[PDB]
Scaffold this motif. Sequence first.
Motif, short mmCIF file in Angstrom:
data_model
loop_
_atom_site.label_atom_id
_atom_site.label_comp_id
_atom_site.label_asym_id
_atom_site.label_seq_id
_atom_site.Cartn_x
_atom_site.Cartn_y
_atom_site.Cartn_z
N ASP A 567 10.28 2.87 11.71
CA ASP A 567 9.32 3.34 12.35
C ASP A 567 9.93 3.61 14.01
OD1 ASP A 567 9.33 0.78 13.56
OD2 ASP A 567 7.17 0.59 13.55
N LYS A 568 11.20 3.75 14.13
CA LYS A 568 11.81 4.19 15.51
C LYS A 568 12.92 5.21 15.23
CE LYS A 568 9.45 1.67 18.47
NZ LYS A 568 9.96 0.36 19.10
N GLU A 596 13.93 -2.58 18.80
CA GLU A 596 13.01 -3.26 17.55
C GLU A 596 12.40 -2.37 16.75
OE1 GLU A 596 9.37 -5.04 20.32
OE2 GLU A 596 11.11 -6.39 19.91
N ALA A 597 12.22 -2.66 15.51
CA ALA A 597 11.73 -1.76 14.43
C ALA A 597 11.28 -2.60 13.28
CB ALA A 597 12.37 -0.57 14.03
N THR A 598 10.41 -2.09 12.48
CA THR A 598 10.19 -2.21 11.13
C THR A 598 10.87 -1.27 10.22
OG1 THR A 598 7.80 -3.02 12.13
CG2 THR A 598 8.22 -3.08 9.67
N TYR A 625 19.09 -13.72 5.77
CA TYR A 625 17.43 -13.28 6.02
C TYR A 625 16.95 -13.06 4.76
CZ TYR A 625 19.62 -11.91 10.41
OH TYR A 625 20.28 -11.86 11.67
N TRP A 627 14.23 -10.56 3.19
CA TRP A 627 13.57 -9.38 3.22
C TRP A 627 12.82 -8.73 2.12
CZ3 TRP A 627 17.71 -6.24 6.14
CH2 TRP A 627 18.02 -6.32 7.38
N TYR A 632 11.00 -7.02 10.03
CA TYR A 632 11.24 -6.69 11.43
C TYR A 632 12.71 -6.89 11.52
CZ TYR A 632 11.40 -7.94 16.41
OH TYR A 632 11.94 -8.15 17.82
N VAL A 633 13.33 -6.19 12.42
CA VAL A 633 14.71 -6.09 13.12
C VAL A 633 14.52 -6.01 14.31
CG1 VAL A 633 15.75 -5.10 10.86
CG2 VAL A 633 15.17 -3.75 12.40
N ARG A 634 15.62 -6.41 14.96
CA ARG A 634 15.93 -6.24 16.41
C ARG A 634 17.47 -6.51 16.84
NH1 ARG A 634 16.71 -8.90 22.00
NH2 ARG A 634 14.93 -8.10 23.21
N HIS A 643 23.09 -4.24 11.16
CA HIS A 643 23.09 -5.42 10.24
C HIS A 643 23.68 -4.69 8.83
CE1 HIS A 643 20.79 -8.18 12.18
NE2 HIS A 643 19.50 -7.42 12.18
O1 LIG Z 1 15.11 -9.99 9.92
C1 LIG Z 1 16.44 -9.78 10.67
C2 LIG Z 1 16.22 -10.23 12.05
O2 LIG Z 1 16.21 -11.62 12.19
C3 LIG Z 1 15.86 -12.15 13.25
O3 LIG Z 1 14.54 -11.87 13.93
C4 LIG Z 1 13.55 -13.03 14.24
C5 LIG Z 1 13.10 -12.53 15.57
O4 LIG Z 1 14.29 -12.98 16.59
C6 LIG Z 1 11.85 -13.45 15.81
O5 LIG Z 1 11.40 -13.27 17.15
C7 LIG Z 1 10.77 -13.33 14.88
O6 LIG Z 1 10.16 -11.88 14.85
C8 LIG Z 1 8.81 -11.81 15.47
C9 LIG Z 1 8.94 -11.56 16.91
O7 LIG Z 1 9.27 -12.74 17.60
C10 LIG Z 1 7.45 -11.43 17.25
O8 LIG Z 1 7.60 -11.07 18.76
C11 LIG Z 1 6.77 -10.42 16.52
O9 LIG Z 1 7.46 -9.03 16.98
C12 LIG Z 1 6.57 -7.85 17.53
C13 LIG Z 1 7.21 -7.55 18.82
O10 LIG Z 1 7.17 -8.72 19.76
C14 LIG Z 1 6.32 -6.51 19.42
O11 LIG Z 1 6.84 -5.92 20.78
C15 LIG Z 1 6.42 -5.15 18.50
O12 LIG Z 1 7.50 -4.57 18.35
C16 LIG Z 1 7.66 -3.19 17.79
C17 LIG Z 1 7.21 -3.17 16.35
O13 LIG Z 1 7.96 -4.07 15.59
C18 LIG Z 1 7.52 -1.84 15.96
O14 LIG Z 1 6.96 -1.95 14.55
C19 LIG Z 1 6.74 -0.62 16.62
O15 LIG Z 1 5.49 -0.83 16.32
O16 LIG Z 1 7.32 -0.82 18.15
C20 LIG Z 1 6.91 -2.13 18.48
C21 LIG Z 1 7.20 -2.11 19.98
O17 LIG Z 1 8.38 -1.51 20.31
O18 LIG Z 1 5.83 -5.77 17.30
C22 LIG Z 1 6.55 -6.79 16.45
C23 LIG Z 1 6.06 -7.30 15.18
O19 LIG Z 1 6.16 -6.16 14.32
O20 LIG Z 1 6.75 -10.71 15.38
C24 LIG Z 1 8.14 -10.73 14.61
C25 LIG Z 1 7.89 -10.91 13.05
O21 LIG Z 1 8.94 -11.76 12.53
O22 LIG Z 1 11.32 -13.62 13.61
C26 LIG Z 1 12.42 -12.78 13.11
C27 LIG Z 1 12.71 -13.13 11.79
O23 LIG Z 1 11.80 -12.95 10.84
C28 LIG Z 1 17.00 -11.94 14.48
O24 LIG Z 1 16.60 -12.45 15.64
C29 LIG Z 1 17.10 -10.33 14.24
O25 LIG Z 1 18.07 -9.96 15.51
C30 LIG Z 1 17.26 -9.57 13.14
O26 LIG Z 1 17.31 -8.37 13.36
#
Ligand SMILES: OC[C@H]1O[C@H](O[C@H]2[C@H](O)[C@@H](O)[C@@H](O[C@H]3[C@H](O)[C@@H](O)[C@@H](O[C@H]4[C@H](O)[C@@H](O)[C@@H](O[C@H]5[C@H](O)[C@@H](O)[C@@H](O)O[C@@H]5CO)O[C@@H]4CO)O[C@@H]3CO)O[C@@H]2CO)[C@H](O)[C@@H](O)[C@@H]1O
Lengths: 649, 649
Positions: A567-568, A596-598, A625, A627, A632-634, A643
């Motif tokens: 989605d990015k 960060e993306a899904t 991980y 999956w 979610y990836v960051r 990755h």
């Molecule tokens: O799987 C590989 C991955 O593993 C590890 O990830 C872990 C995270 O470090 C950990 O934080 C957790 O993830 C949570 C997250 O913490 C929580 O905040 C939430 O994420 C939110 C964002 O905070 C929010 O801003 C928003 O972000 C995006 C969104 O994803 C995207 O779809 C779009 O809409 O734009 C938004 C803004 O830019 O939403 C997300 C949620 O969609 O939920 C997360 C769910 O898990 O757990 C992770 C492991 O499961 C590693 O750290 C990482 O490096 C690796 O890539």
Amino acid sequence: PTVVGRIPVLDVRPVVQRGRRPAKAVTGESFEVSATVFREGHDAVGANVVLRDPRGRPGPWTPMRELAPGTDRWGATVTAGETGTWSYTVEAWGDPVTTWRHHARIKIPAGLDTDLVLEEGARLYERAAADVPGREDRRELLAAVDALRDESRPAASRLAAALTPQVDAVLARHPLRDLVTSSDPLPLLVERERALYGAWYEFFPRSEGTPHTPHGTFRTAARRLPAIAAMGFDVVYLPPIHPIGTTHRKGRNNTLSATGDDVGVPWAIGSPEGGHDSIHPALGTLDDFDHFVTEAGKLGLEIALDFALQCSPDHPWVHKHPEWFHHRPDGTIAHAENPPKKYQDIYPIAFDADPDGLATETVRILRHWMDHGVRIFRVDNPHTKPVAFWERVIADINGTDPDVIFLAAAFTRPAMMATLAQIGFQQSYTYFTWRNTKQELTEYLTELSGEAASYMRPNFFANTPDILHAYLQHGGRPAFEVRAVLAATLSPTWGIYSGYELCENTPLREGSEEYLDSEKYQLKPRDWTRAAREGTTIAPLVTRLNTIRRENPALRQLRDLHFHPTDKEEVIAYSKRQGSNTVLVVVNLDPRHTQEATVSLDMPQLGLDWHESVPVRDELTGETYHWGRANYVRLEPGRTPAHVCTVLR
Amino acid sequence: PTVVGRIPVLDVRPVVQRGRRPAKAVTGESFEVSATVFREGHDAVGANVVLRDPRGRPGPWTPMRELAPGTDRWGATVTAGETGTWSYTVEAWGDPVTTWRHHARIKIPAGLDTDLVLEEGARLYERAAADVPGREDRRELLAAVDALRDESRPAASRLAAALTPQVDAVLARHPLRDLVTSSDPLPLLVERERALYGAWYEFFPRSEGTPHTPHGTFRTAARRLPAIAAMGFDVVYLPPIHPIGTTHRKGRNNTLSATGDDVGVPWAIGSPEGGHDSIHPALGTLDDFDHFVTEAGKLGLEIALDFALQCSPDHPWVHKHPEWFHHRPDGTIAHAENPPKKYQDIYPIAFDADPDGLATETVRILRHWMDHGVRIFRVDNPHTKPVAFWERVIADINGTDPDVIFLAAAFTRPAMMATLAQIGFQQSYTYFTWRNTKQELTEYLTELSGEAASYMRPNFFANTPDILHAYLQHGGRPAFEVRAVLAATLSPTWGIYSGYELCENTPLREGSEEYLDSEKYQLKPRDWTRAAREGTTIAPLVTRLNTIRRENPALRQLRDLHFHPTDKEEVIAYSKRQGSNTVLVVVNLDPRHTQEATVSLDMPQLGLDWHESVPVRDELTGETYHWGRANYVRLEPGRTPAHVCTVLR
Ligand SMILES: OC[C@H]1O[C@H](O[C@H]2[C@H](O)[C@@H](O)[C@@H](O[C@H]3[C@H](O)[C@@H](O)[C@@H](O[C@H]4[C@H](O)[C@@H](O)[C@@H](O[C@H]5[C@H](O)[C@@H](O)[C@@H](O)O[C@@H]5CO)O[C@@H]4CO)O[C@@H]3CO)O[C@@H]2CO)[C@H](O)[C@@H](O)[C@@H]1O
Ligand SMILES: OC[C@H]1O[C@H](O[C@H]2[C@H](O)[C@@H](O)[C@@H](O[C@H]3[C@H](O)[C@@H](O)[C@@H](O[C@H]4[C@H](O)[C@@H](O)[C@@H](O[C@H]5[C@H](O)[C@@H](O)[C@@H](O[C@H]6[C@H](O)[C@@H](O)[C@@H](O[C@H]7[C@H](O)[C@@H](O)[C@@H](O[C@H]8[C@H](O)[C@@H](O)[C@@H](O)O[C@@H]8CO)O[C@@H]7CO)O[C@@H]6CO)O[C@@H]5CO)O[C@@H]4CO)O[C@@H]3CO)O[C@@H]2CO)[C@H](O)[C@@H](O)[C@@H]1O
Ligand SMILES: OC[C@H]1O[C@H](O[C@H]2[C@H](O)[C@@H](O)[C@@H](O[C@H]3[C@H](O)[C@@H](O)[C@@H](O[C@H]4[C@H](O)[C@@H](O)[C@@H](O[C@H]5[C@H](O)[C@@H](O)[C@@H](O[C@H]6[C@H](O)[C@@H](O)[C@@H](O[C@H]7[C@H](O)[C@@H](O)[C@@H](O[C@H]8[C@H](O)[C@@H](O)[C@@H](O)O[C@@H]8CO)O[C@@H]7CO)O[C@@H]6CO)O[C@@H]5CO)O[C@@H]4CO)O[C@@H]3CO)O[C@@H]2CO)[C@H](O)[C@@H](O)[C@@H]1O
Ligand SMILES: OC[C@H]1O[C@H](O[C@H]2[C@H](O)[C@@H](O)[C@@H](O[C@H]3[C@H](O)[C@@H](O)[C@@H](O[C@H]4[C@H](O)[C@@H](O)[C@@H](O[C@H]5[C@H](O)[C@@H](O)[C@@H](O)O[C@@H]5CO)O[C@@H]4CO)O[C@@H]3CO)O[C@@H]2CO)[C@H](O)[C@@H](O)[C@@H]1O
């Protein structure tokens, strides 16, 4: 006669130039053979692929299936064995057994003509037993026939003794095939593994010198071989190793006049000291070159020499073979061009006075270097020599030495690029360096892994001595990390030019793709030990990427590739498969900002259920991980470019 | 021997089954021959098309141009002449004069080697001069040589003397071609005009009877021909005219058992009174048929007989040639099916026991009807007989009588549709009746007028006795007007089944495409005089549409067709051109609601300026508007279904 057979089988693919040139594979490589297959009326059809080896021996039973409903397009995966010229055929046929089962499923329950339907059954199964050559199999079928004709059992009893998994097995292997119709054979050239799969490293031996003797030799440059092998490379591409001309020699940074010390451009081939069959005296002797090749070989590295069919004004050919050049009314020869670039240090060859003389001399030269252990040639600017000349040359070399590989450095329009690959070039350079956004990569890799894979094997050099893209210029080290991940995972052949490890990215000026102080026009000593010590190299990532390729068969093929939606704009995702090996890659293409993306995976494409969860290991970190359909990836540039994951099976 | 020539010329189109089957055209028809053409290096290429007639006589000079920049894809229009098998070839060549010009236009204002450049041109123009036939032309070229050579004149004036419009003309007609390279010849089949262009009318003779003799004869049915010719039709399609079976004969509205005076379905061919070589005794004698055919011809109508290769159980063939049917274990023959449509009144033919006798008998039956002036056959359900059977049969008949036209009624999947046309069917029924929206029409017609035009010619029946589409059911008379204008203007061949005029749109039931009280199972007397007296017929519009077609050559061809944007989804616009004739058509697809929209034309695509205006005349009304880049239209159902405008120039 009639063009169309009894059961239509049409437009068999792959095909290259309508059958006049072979499709391509390498030993061990799987690819799809397809065709349009159908019949008159509503009865079922089946189809299979008969792949034949160079001695004519058919391959295994390979049934096809309709690739999407209503299309009448059938396909099946085949796999190539030993090297040589193969053929493939699609056989199409009426499938009376599927037809009868389809009708016997509906008519027997709802009551219609039951004794008749089952007796139509028994006669098919009896005709099936004749073509079956094994006796235990044949008895499994004659049991179904007697059970079909046994009128003391009720209706659904006599039916279901023909639809067991025990009988399915025999008919899946030896089905009853009506009206076998065969396509005409199409040709397949199967070459060695290295044609499709390998990692390549380019460097200038002359740069690896000493304090007392700055100009490197083959003896001194051999000291880089251990390190290049330690990075996981398989091929070492050397720029031209022949004497370099003095007349119109270019100076530093592509200036017109050389100073006294200036080394000139290796591509300006030829002097009184020799031509394309000679060694630059500063590099050493033919003997020193054999020792370099021998050391390379003991480290698992093959040597690829640049073959550039052009001359400096001092090349012996200028006086020995004037007729191999176009002369203007005043006798002079126009220097080569590739606008807006001018090559004032060289003359292009003309081919129309003496094409025979030139082909003869060319294959003589190649045979010389082949005698000295060079089985790969990187061909410079092939698109400025005639297409038919390369078709003749390659046919001649492969006629006697089919293992030789030619790589077309054809940075040019699509038609010529394609055509060069189709007339025999084993590999091609590509538009890779100019595909940097997600859309660009997806579009282009969709093209290379699709139809093009039947005639083209791409070699993804992330940089070259003439190509430093603005992506690398502007994005620095995180950018180099991204393009190496991309190159090594999207193509089974990739490469770098020495200095990529150090993130050298200073252009000649803004808007250029040339390096400042380019190695093409000067000796370029590099402090390799200091870069290792201070961690300012990406040699570990490069080493790791080659280990991952060596450990995962999915990354040593091209055609099995699929892109999964994120989605990015900046995060791209793809997977590749080969038997039980599945590799799943996610790359942040932003080298300045964390993304960060899904990543929404396309699970049927991974051979999985939508609701399933599967373990993965990032091979760049060793972190595991879990999956599934939505992940979610960051990704933070500097720290994690991508990755690169295997699916734990 | 190389596959690739000196100057690559590759992938010549059109091509059908890789050159194993001819592309098609008709006398007078223009289409595009294209090819991929390029060469090594930067110098210019040229190319041309050599169309050869059946005796080998080459056509006129026909130079190609690159169709889009950077694609290396070249094309030119050719026009087919007399009927027979033609061939076409693309010649590609170095164009040294263009190359010299581009180099000289730069190098003379610069001052770089000017005496040397101008001598190079002189020597080229000397070569050009030698190959020219004309005396006046050779003098014009040798003048430009002396002007190039005159070292006492300035550089820009020596060059200018070789760049004139006077010289440009000579060289465009007789250019200097280096290294001429030819494609292999591809076959073209050229057929009579009627194969592409014509208006068709289907009717059942038996429904044109009298009060005292209800079942029509050929004598009574001949009196319907004048109204058919007054409507401006060219072809009369008659359903099968043979005797009809009684065993399992169908009653009215497709019920299983007929009453004592039920006439049955014409397609259930055969009784003791004869088969496919006989006349139904209620229709008259063979002699009455000859009078009918003659009367048709006197009015400029040709006859097309239905050829349906199938049998009623009472057809002599059942007992004479048992091997021409498939028999179940009890010796009964399963009735024909096209699920979920059951055909209880007929048997399908089986082909694998006696294909030679079946072919022999089929060509004999066809030749019989050809002896009585039937030169067109509408072949029923061709997709239920083997593809290779029709290939053989058509090749046979056209081998002696190439003017015979076969029309494939193949309402089936795309792959079979296409294959039938490619193996020889001059014409094909289409998916036209299931393409009613703007998106559907545009997509489908783009398909039919592009690449498939080289092997398929469409016949757009707005209805058939099997197809009353819901658009017409829910639409009423306004919908009949819309579909008639669409069919007549989008394909050079269209047609209707009688009753279309009267806006007959009652279906058997809701969600069916069958007519209530279908003419297939009953006499269907129609009071043609009454409907004309009362205006409850669109026979005037039909007459007008055919007359427009007869007067605008744009509507007598298929391939030139472009769609122009509009801002309402319910309004579609398109143009068609042929020489200096250009027909604009705007249609309101809404039959219930009045529609207004802006039609934004694509003015370059009409050969005009973006800032231009043009006088048009709606041939439906006689009204005249002044249209340009953007145009208001108001289309009111009943009064104005469409505009069918010509361009006055
Ligand atoms: O799987 C590989 C991955 O593993 C590890 O990830 C872990 C995270 O470090 C950990 O934080 C957790 O993830 C949570 C997250 O913490 C929580 O905040 C939430 O994420 C939110 C964002 O905070 C929010 O801003 C928003 O972000 C995006 C969104 O994803 C995207 O779809 C779009 O809409 O734009 C938004 C803004 O830019 O939403 C997300 C949620 O969609 O939920 C997360 C769910 O898990 O757990 C992770 C492991 O499961 C590693 O750290 C990482 O490096 C690796 O890539
Ligand atoms: O001592 C001698 C000598 O030694 C050295 O030189 C040697 C080198 O060391 C050696 O490596 C070798 O290098 C040279 C090489 O062999 C040459 O070919 C040459 O290549 C360079 C090109 O000259 C240069 O222009 C550039 O070209 C690339 C582009 O910049 C890229 O963007 C890319 O372009 C391709 C597109 O990516 C691709 O999509 C496709 O484009 C098509 C479009 O898709 C299509 O829509 C259509 O476009 C239309 C538009 O739609 C329309 O609106 C309108 O704009 O027109 C366009 C088209 O006109 O068509 C498009 C196709 O045209 O294809 C594009 C390809 O054209 O790729 C380009 C090519 O790769 O970089 C090239 C690589 O560097 O020069 C090399 C360097 O010299 O040989 C040398 C000699 O031995 C020293 O360096 C010397 O100093 C010394 O003298
Ligand atoms: O006395 C004897 C006897 O006499 C009479 O009968 C005779 C008749 O008088 C005579 O005229 C003659 O008529 C018969 C005719 O010859 C027969 O063929 C038969 O034709 C009818 C069909 O049976 C009937 O089904 C129907 O079919 C049409 C459909 O209704 C339309 O919708 C249309 O469909 C086509 C699409 O438009 C087209 O796009 C294409 O579709 C493909 C897609 O493009 C592709 O993407 C893919 O789709 C996938 C999707 O992607 C996926 O998501 C998912 O949905 O699956 C699909 C695939 O399943 O594939 C698609 C298909 O490949 O093709 C579509 C069709 O294939 O066109 C259909 C066919 O044109 O109407 C037909 C016309 O009438 O029956 C005629 C009438 O009998 O012969 C008779 C016998 O002599 C009397 O009437 C009798 O009573 C008497 O007994
Ligand atoms: O060209 C074929 C056409 O020729 C003749 O039409 C002429 C008219 O008779 C004449 O009145 C004049 O048209 C005027 C119109 O009268 C006037 O009302 C105005 O039209 C407005 C609509 O009122 C308005 O609703 C809106 O309509 C559309 C819009 O076109 C479309 O782009 C979209 O936005 O949807 C809207 C909602 O339906 O805008 C239009 C203007 O754009 O201005 C018209 C200007 O011409 O001149 C006509 C041309 O000679 C024949 O009489 C007619 O039958 C033929 O079809």
